[PDB]
Design an enzyme around this catalytic site. Structure first.
Site, PDB file in Angstrom:
ATOM      1  N   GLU A  79     -35.047  19.361  -6.295  1.00  0.00           N
ATOM      2  CA  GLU A  79     -33.994  19.523  -7.289  1.00  0.00           C
ATOM      3  C   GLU A  79     -33.924  18.304  -8.202  1.00  0.00           C
ATOM      4  O   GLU A  79     -33.882  18.475  -9.430  1.00  0.00           O
ATOM      5  CB  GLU A  79     -32.648  19.787  -6.603  1.00  0.00           C
ATOM      6  CG  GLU A  79     -31.543  20.053  -7.611  1.00  0.00           C
ATOM      7  CD  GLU A  79     -31.748  21.306  -8.380  1.00  0.00           C
ATOM      8  OE1 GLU A  79     -31.607  22.385  -7.741  1.00  0.00           O
ATOM      9  OE2 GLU A  79     -32.023  21.296  -9.580  1.00  0.00           O
ATOM     10  N   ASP A  83     -34.669  18.242 -12.200  1.00  0.00           N
ATOM     11  CA  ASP A  83     -33.641  17.846 -13.135  1.00  0.00           C
ATOM     12  C   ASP A  83     -34.150  16.723 -14.032  1.00  0.00           C
ATOM     13  O   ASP A  83     -34.022  16.744 -15.247  1.00  0.00           O
ATOM     14  CB  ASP A  83     -32.370  17.397 -12.409  1.00  0.00           C
ATOM     15  CG  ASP A  83     -31.786  18.416 -11.440  1.00  0.00           C
ATOM     16  OD1 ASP A  83     -30.931  18.074 -10.619  1.00  0.00           O
ATOM     17  OD2 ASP A  83     -32.256  19.622 -11.550  1.00  0.00           O
ATOM     18  N   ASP A 169     -27.693  31.028  -9.135  1.00  0.00           N
ATOM     19  CA  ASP A 169     -28.994  31.658  -8.901  1.00  0.00           C
ATOM     20  C   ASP A 169     -28.896  32.964  -8.148  1.00  0.00           C
ATOM     21  O   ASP A 169     -29.930  33.509  -7.722  1.00  0.00           O
ATOM     22  CB  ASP A 169     -29.909  30.706  -8.177  1.00  0.00           C
ATOM     23  CG  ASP A 169     -30.432  29.546  -9.007  1.00  0.00           C
ATOM     24  OD1 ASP A 169     -31.199  28.748  -8.389  1.00  0.00           O
ATOM     25  OD2 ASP A 169     -30.144  29.464 -10.203  1.00  0.00           O
ATOM     26  N   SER A 286     -30.865  25.894 -12.161  1.00  0.00           N
ATOM     27  CA  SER A 286     -31.127  24.495 -11.930  1.00  0.00           C
ATOM     28  C   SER A 286     -32.116  23.869 -12.923  1.00  0.00           C
ATOM     29  O   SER A 286     -32.105  22.660 -13.060  1.00  0.00           O
ATOM     30  CB  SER A 286     -31.810  24.202 -10.568  1.00  0.00           C
ATOM     31  OG  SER A 286     -30.949  24.359  -9.462  1.00  0.00           O
ATOM     32  N   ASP A 327     -30.268  35.195 -29.370  1.00  0.00           N
ATOM     33  CA  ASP A 327     -29.358  36.108 -28.712  1.00  0.00           C
ATOM     34  C   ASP A 327     -30.110  36.979 -27.721  1.00  0.00           C
ATOM     35  O   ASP A 327     -30.861  37.877 -28.114  1.00  0.00           O
ATOM     36  CB  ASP A 327     -28.675  37.000 -29.764  1.00  0.00           C
ATOM     37  CG  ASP A 327     -27.657  37.959 -29.186  1.00  0.00           C
ATOM     38  OD1 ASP A 327     -27.223  37.714 -28.037  1.00  0.00           O
ATOM     39  OD2 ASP A 327     -27.308  38.936 -29.903  1.00  0.00           O
ATOM     40  N   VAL A 328     -29.902  36.762 -26.427  1.00  0.00           N
ATOM     41  CA  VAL A 328     -30.555  37.595 -25.418  1.00  0.00           C
ATOM     42  C   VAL A 328     -29.895  38.949 -25.413  1.00  0.00           C
ATOM     43  O   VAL A 328     -28.644  39.044 -25.398  1.00  0.00           O
ATOM     44  CB  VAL A 328     -30.470  36.916 -24.040  1.00  0.00           C
ATOM     45  CG1 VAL A 328     -31.063  37.811 -22.981  1.00  0.00           C
ATOM     46  CG2 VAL A 328     -31.158  35.543 -24.090  1.00  0.00           C
ATOM     47  N   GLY A 343     -26.371  42.032 -24.077  1.00  0.00           N
ATOM     48  CA  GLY A 343     -26.129  42.841 -25.244  1.00  0.00           C
ATOM     49  C   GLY A 343     -25.995  41.979 -26.477  1.00  0.00           C
ATOM     50  O   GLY A 343     -26.255  40.768 -26.447  1.00  0.00           O
TER      51      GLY A 343
HETATM   52 CA   LIG Z   1     -26.493  38.495 -25.979  1.00  0.00          CA
END
Ligand SMILES: [Ca+2]
Length: 369
Positions: A79, A83, A169, A286, A327-328, A343
């Protein structure tokens, strides 16, 4: 479109359009850890040396009792490796200083971790602090950890520090034994659900053959062989009230909505990280949080470390200026037909999506932040 593959951390500036920005050479960055970082510092030297980068100035801080246990947690090193290497790569290969705020492992319950947060806020030397940690917010609430830590994060925000926290996660199944499918029963991670931190969710990142950004979908890699879900945390806190700046996301409860923004998290599209000397391809939220931290630290260096806690500005700027983000739109953060769907605009798996850094920098130059 595009290809799913692993990425060197030095690629994240090109992917997220940060190459034209200053590096984070003028910004001090913190990382919260549980225990020591001795192997992590060797892996960091391997990282900078292999990539031909100038060496990174580090400090380690024992945040609790001087009699505490700051030995290395062996798994934990992966980790802290993820990071630190992801921060430095995303930052353009330089940070002013990297401070490791180490929690005492022999302190009772969550008090060692609380004291690590407290030390970072009391010192007030790091402008941006990574927290690639989380657990069920209802557990944190039950034992008083939530209240104690929220006071610390509130002080951070008021003093102009940015804490960045991985959204989780476990997809929507944070509180069900840390990620076991639970139907329509949805929950979120602490400390991501604090309104005093930036919560960072996770994407599946596709790149072109030339290495450029192609597209991002929700991070959801389904179940492991134990039956646990690996997907981006997102939803709303059951406890924390909605901060007023989130009112721009209409049709949501009166609660803190998370994540705020997202970056690469899929293991299949993740970061190549040196861990005990060996390269591993690692993801999770992470990963997404330290990407944000390194990119944000560049913007701090471009602005004389004068940018305050940015949540309100992200919501006002991005809602009014869709060109600032990727924008996902595709995917979900549950299992079996359950979970939230991405959306148009802000959504529960990914928040606003990922930042286009040079476009955000131009916005800040024009408008402030
Ligand atoms: Ca979105």
């Amino acid at each position: 479109a595009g290809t799913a593959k692993g990425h060197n951390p030095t690629e994240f500036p090109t992917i997220y359009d940060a190459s034209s920005a200053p590096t984070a050479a003028n910004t001090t960055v913190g990382i919260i850890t549980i225990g020591g970082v001795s192997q992590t510092l060797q892996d960091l030297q391997q990282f900078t040396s292999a990539n031909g980068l100038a060496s990174v100035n580090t400090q380690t801080i024992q945040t609790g009792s001087s009699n505490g246990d700051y030995s290395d947690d062996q798994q934990g090193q992966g980790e802290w490796d993820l990071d630190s290497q992801s921060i430095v790569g995303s930052a353009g290969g330089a940070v002013q200083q990297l401070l490791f705020y180490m929690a005492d492992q022999s302190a009772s319950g969550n008090t060692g971790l609380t004291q690590a947060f407290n030390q970072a806020v009391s010192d007030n030397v790091a402008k941006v602090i990574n927290v690639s940690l989380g657990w069920c917010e209802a557990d944190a609430n039950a034992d008083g950890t939530l209240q104690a830590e929220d006071r610390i994060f509130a002080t951070a925000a008021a003093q102009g520090q940015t804490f960045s926290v991985s959204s989780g996660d476990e997809g929507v199944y944070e509180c069900n034994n840390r990620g076991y499918p639970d139907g329509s029963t949805y929950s979120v991670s602490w400390p991501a659900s604090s309104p005093n931190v930036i919560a960072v969710g996770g994407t599946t990142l596709y790149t072109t053959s030339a290495g450029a950004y192609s597209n991002e979908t929700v991070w959801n890699e389904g179940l492991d062989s134990n039956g646990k879900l690996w997907a981006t945390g997102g939803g709303y806190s059951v406890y924390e009230s909605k901060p007023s700046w989130q009112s721009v996301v209409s049709g949501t409860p009166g609660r803190r909505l998370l994540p705020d923004i997202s970056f690469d998290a899929a293991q299949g599209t993740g970061a190549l990280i040196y861990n005990y000397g060996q390269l591993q391809q690692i993801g999770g939220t992470s990963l997404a949080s330290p990407i944000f931290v390194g990119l944000w630290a560049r913007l701090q260096s471009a602005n004389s470390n004068s940018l305050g806690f940015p949540a309100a500005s992200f919501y006002s700027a991005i809602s009014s200026t869709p060109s600032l983000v990727h924008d996902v739109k595709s995917g979900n953060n549950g299992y079996g037909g359950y979970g939230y769907n991405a959306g148009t605009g802000w959504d529960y798996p990914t928040g606003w999506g990922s930042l286009d850094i040079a476009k955000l920098s131009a916005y800040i130059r024009s408008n402030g932040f």
